[PDB]
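Hey, I was hoping to borrow your eyes for a little while. There's a protein on my desk that I can't quite get my head around. The fold is given in discrete form, as structure tokens running alongside the sequence. I'd be grateful if you could look everything over and explain what you see. Here's the protein in full, and shout if anything looks odd to you:
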Amino acid sequence: GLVPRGSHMATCDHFMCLQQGSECDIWDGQPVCKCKDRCEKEPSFTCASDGLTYYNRCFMDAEACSKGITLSVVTCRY
């Protein structure tokens, strides 16, 4: 438990990542944004602004993050 006095690890509390589906992580002592990529297999089919359909909103967000884009929900019509 010996540490340099007047030092602390970095934390994500006061940072936000604007990219849909992303979250802050600490890498090499600095905040960075990374895609979460973890969702429940709980169906809630979601049509999106790209014209495609997602298993739920979490999967929509994960695709948005993977592509570096923004996807919004639209009504499915049939």
Observations:
- Helices lie at 57-67.
- The radius of gyration is 17 Å.
